[PDB]
Design a protein around this ligand. Structure first.
Ligand code: DHE
Ligand code: DHE
Ligand code: HEC
Ligand code: HEC
Ligand SMILES: [Cl-]
Ligand SMILES: [Cl-]
Ligand SMILES: [O-]
Ligand SMILES: [O-]
Lengths: 539, 538
């Protein structure tokens, strides 16, 4: 009873300021559930699970009830010129469904489940123990020139032989794999589904097979491996959208070791955000650390894994809505884009500080980017945009080019907006830019190609989808990617699940069609990752 | 383009996203009546989101599982595991108990957040640093000054150590929990349970405030940078609500950084929506702050070398971290994980957990008591709330490795309900209070041990009786020495409508030396001698 009286006094919290949430329009289970289904299918991607993920005012009951039914129905029906699509005018949703959505967002957001160590360990599986694995490569494949291609809707990936242009093996994975990464030893391929399911693949088995799997959350986009000298295959890390966390696992068995929450304060307003989704992750070559991007809070965390028992993290403020990015030519400065902020943040992995914030076009989407030496400006890194058809060129040589370092030194103009990936190679004199989400069929079905030796000349349009000879469907082209020797560039013709897709290969030296990869198993091909170029960050 | 880019369905499955309810309907006045009682009688232990106590959380998934009649029965009769009985004791009525059972079956109401906009708004620079004196403009003996908390009055009193008189009374936040000194010895920092901080300049004609700010809705700790070359550089504070800690300018109190403590636990490694910040201590080995995170049982090493890009080292200890203090060398932080019945040892130099020592039932050391044992060498001691034991733990890995981080021995006090143990380098006595012991006489007195003869039983000093105050519980709490170390002060914490006092004992003779009475001395609690606090002399 002593300790009971010790903790007996009243809380300093004032009961009058603790608020009960409600005042929302009544809706039955049937109604609420119908709206909820539409929300996660059509609205969650942008607005998040807790509805504070998009720009502008959140869809939380404090704001939505302020607006009212009529305002909400009207906004959902016609959308806004600032990124909010129209659901009524387009005919996507009915007025009955819209009335339900307006009522739905006036209620407290329903909570998805958490995903802690117990859930992770339960999902963890060692298919083949390290001891039972081969001591050397048991097949005669040219592993470095292998391509890990995502068979999105089929929940698989396919290993495609670079030179033979044929599928060597199809592997079952998590749903709609987002990216594929290579371990520092060049032996293990890591893939992560958008459902947060990771699969570890041993390229040395007679037939490349999975040796381990685990689920790190409910939804995720990124996975990465330790690339600092002396740590080959030591640790694997992955970022989840939900729950807002990232986990570190054993690089050899995928055993969950540490789980860290990213819920916290924003860089701009320094206010609390309950859903800071983890975006791009890149491994540092300067220190034994992982560079993790936190979207909504706009924070870049340097997670040191020299000692994972007592985790040391350095939090660098950048800019809101961090997404994708990649190394500069020297592999020291992490060029990442804060797309909704229309800026590119530059992270010095050596000094461990924000080198700069560069103003670019509308919604930068570099991917990993494209590096090359500009005649006039020296070493640069480039990115295309979703919001416009411009290409930003940024100086990345502070040491020998201080006049151009971290400055949007110049621009280029591609076919138009809706661009996703820009690309080049050290041995190439070409710069490729796609237009996957451009509203025009012809533009979305082709790629622009610039001449690095003559940047003043207009790009040449390569009819990628046309060359595929596939028939009907949107046939959107996406992410250009080089081979080991980078004497040929690959593209994906992302056609419908019930349509016909293909991989188109172009001779980089001549800009001529070289091969077209077709197979009934090649369903909804999206991302493609050459083993060598991915492992050694060649872009 | 961007609308089609971010247009695919979320991987989150709608069928697993749950809408909450199935709770017993209650009107606004019924809900508010129950809510008021919750924060007044239950929040302390269970927390705002009701996941703060041991055992099962009071969240709707568990409470609705238990049912209305199970909940009423438990609230009425309590349990022998830390849950008080509210019906049997007659504290709450059956109508109120029914309202509470219904209340906990509903989603926990949410108090507001408190970020940078709220902090800068509460921020006030009363006297700019350039307008502050360049020298001590008074004749006071600052180092032997005592900062006494006048809890219920929302003030503190500066009492002159040698003269025994109140030098000044200052208006502060409600119920200040602790006083702390800047490394320069010039500034006094106080923080109320309401999270309001006040910076006082002891060099002014009259010791007055020069700045203040609110860093939350509820807090308990505040600290100053004590690493060499960082004198009055930064000031940190931990809050209960929201679960965060903030770093400010050690000269103006200007909010700089705010970090959330919400995260995974050390044991189950699961998410905890309310890990509250406890004790905080400034490292002397590295320019960093050592912060304790209760519920998640984590000890963070917040480096302020570069306040723009904060680097934090998270060290897992044990759940329910609370208070603690340095060993004799000021290298190892001895903190208690009360509900786990353990004391964690954090090596601030090597920056790792040196060990987990098993002690008594609910250890409550405060800052602890360091002294050299005749046999086991240098030790660090603590008393308990759960029992009458006193643990002695070896703290010398270099010259006494065989006793390092071990419960080397045990002493026995008057009983449970103990809050603080104390000693001094110049003293040969060890004092331990028993503030919350259910027996009036035991709670109104303290035990004193002879460090030159630990085998001998303690002596009992009638502190409250010596005060001659009349009626009231007259609970005695927290012994504290003067800079010299020949005087030991005690607070006689009586009701606000009763008479309280500070009793001072001659440590050399164990005889009454003085009694401080004043109509302004209302509900005196914590007393902090300037020198001993500033230099961690304990
Ligand atoms: C955070 C993130 C990364 C960086 C990972 C890294 O390198 O660590 C990334 C990279 C990528 C990369 C990396 C390419 C590279 O060369 O590095 C690819 C191929 C890719 C295919 C797609 N992405 Fe991606 N992508 C998201 C998130 C991300 N995508 C989304 O949340 C978004 C906007 C909506 C969604 O539904 O997921 C989205 C849409 C897409 C697509 O439309 C693509 C083409 C197909 C799909 O399945 O969604 N994302
Ligand atoms: C986190 C924490 C510390 C360590 C701070 C540091 O070192 O930086 C501390 C220290 C302290 C210290 C430090 C003493 C020292 O010598 O270091 C004092 C005087 C003190 C007086 C009280 N404490 Fe305290 N105290 C709490 C929390 C804490 N108390 C509670 O939450 C609790 C259990 C319940 C409550 O109602 O606050 C509680 C009850 C009490 C009391 O009942 C006291 C006697 C009076 C009061 O106002 O609550 N606490
Ligand atoms: C700390 C001194 C407490 C105060 C004040 C209150 N509660 Fe508590 N409660 C506490 C503990 C340590 C425990 C677990 C005890 C055990 O035997 O497991 C509890 C438990 C409860 C429960 C039951 C939980 C369950 O098993 O389903 C209830 C319903 C409960 N407490 C309610 C509650 C209320 C409403 C209180 C204020 C009027 C209250 N508790 C105060 C510790 C403490
Ligand atoms: C991204 C491609 C979006 C999708 C898909 C949906 N919304 Fe959206 N929404 C988005 C943005 C960028 C904004 C801000 C627009 C602005 O001009 O400020 C919004 C805003 C809304 C609002 C209004 C909020 C307010 O100002 O009070 C509502 C009510 C809203 N969005 C609802 C909503 C629903 C129900 C959706 C799916 C059926 C949905 N949005 C999709 C971005 C995007
Ligand atoms: Cl934070
Ligand atoms: Cl965490
Ligand atoms: O992407
Ligand atoms: O305390």
């Amino acid at each position: 009873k002593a300790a009971e009286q010790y903790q007996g006094a009243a809380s300093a919290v004032d009961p009058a300021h603790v608020v009960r949430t409600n005042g929302a329009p009544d809706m039955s289970e049937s109604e609420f559930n119908e709206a909820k289904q539409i929300y996660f299918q059509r609205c969650a991607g942008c607005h998040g699970v807790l509805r504070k993920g998009a720009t502008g005012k959140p869809l939380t009951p404090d704001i939505t009830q302020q607006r009212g039914q009529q305002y909400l129905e009207a906004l959902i029906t016609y959308g806004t010129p600032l990124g909010m699509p129209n659901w009524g005018s387009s005919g996507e949703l009915s007025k009955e469904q819209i009335t339900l959505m307006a009522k739905y967002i006036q209620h407290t957001p329903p909570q998805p489940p958490e995903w802690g160590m117990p859930e992770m360990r339960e999902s963890w599986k060692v298919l083949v123990k390290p001891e039972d694995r081969p001591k050397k490569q048991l097949n005669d494949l040219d592993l470095p020139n292998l391509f890990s291609v995502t068979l999105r809707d089929a929940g698989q990936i396919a290993l495609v032989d670079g030179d033979s242009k044929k599928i060597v093996k199809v592997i079952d994975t998590g749903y709609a794999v987002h990216i594929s990464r290579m371990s520092a030893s060049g032996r293990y391929l890591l893939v992560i589904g958008r459902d947060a399911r990771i699969d570890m693949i041993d390229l040395w088995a007679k037939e490349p097979t999975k040796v381990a799997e685990i689920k790190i959350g409910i939804e995720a986009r990124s996975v990465e491996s330790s690339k600092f000298k002396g740590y080959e295959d030591r640790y694997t890390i992955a970022g989840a959208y939900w729950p807002p966390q990232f986990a570190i696992m054993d690089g050899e068995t995928l055993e969950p070791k540490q789980i860290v929450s990213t819920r916290g304060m924003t860089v701009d307003t320094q206010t609390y955000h309950p859903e800071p989704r983890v975006a791009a992750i890149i491994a540092s070559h300067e220190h034994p650390e992982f560079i993790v991007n936190v979207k909504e809070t706009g924070k870049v965390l340097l997670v040191n894994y020299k000692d994972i028992d007592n985790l040391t993290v350095t939090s660098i403020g950048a800019a809101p809505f961090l997404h994708d990015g990649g190394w500069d030519s020297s592999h020291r400065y992490f060029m990442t884009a804060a797309n909704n902020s229309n800026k590119v943040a530059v992270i010095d992995s050596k000094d461990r500080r924000l080198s700069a914030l560069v103003d670019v076009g509308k919604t930068p989407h570099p991917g990993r980017g494209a590096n090359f030496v500009h005649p006039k400006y020296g070493p640069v890194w480039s990115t295309s945009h979703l919001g416009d058809g411009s290409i930003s060129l940024i100086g990345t040589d502070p040491k020998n080019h201080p006049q151009y370092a971290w400055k949007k030194v110049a621009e280029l103009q591609g076919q138009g907006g809706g661009s996703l990936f820009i690309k080049t190679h050290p041995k190439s004199s070409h710069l490729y830019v796609d237009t996957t989400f451009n509203p025009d069929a012809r533009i979305s079905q082709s790629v622009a190609v610039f001449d690095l030796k003559n940047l003043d000349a207009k790009y040449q349009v390569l009819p990628i989808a046309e060359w595929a000879d596939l028939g009907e469907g949107a046939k959107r082209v996406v992410q250009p990617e080089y081979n080991k020797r980078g004497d040929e560039v690959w593209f994906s013709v992302w056609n419908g699940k019930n349509d016909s897709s293909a991989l188109v290969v172009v001779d980089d030296k001549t800009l001529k069609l070289k091969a077209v990869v077709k197979d009934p198993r090649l369903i909804t091909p999206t991302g493609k990752f050459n083993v060598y170029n991915t492992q050694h960050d060649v872009y």
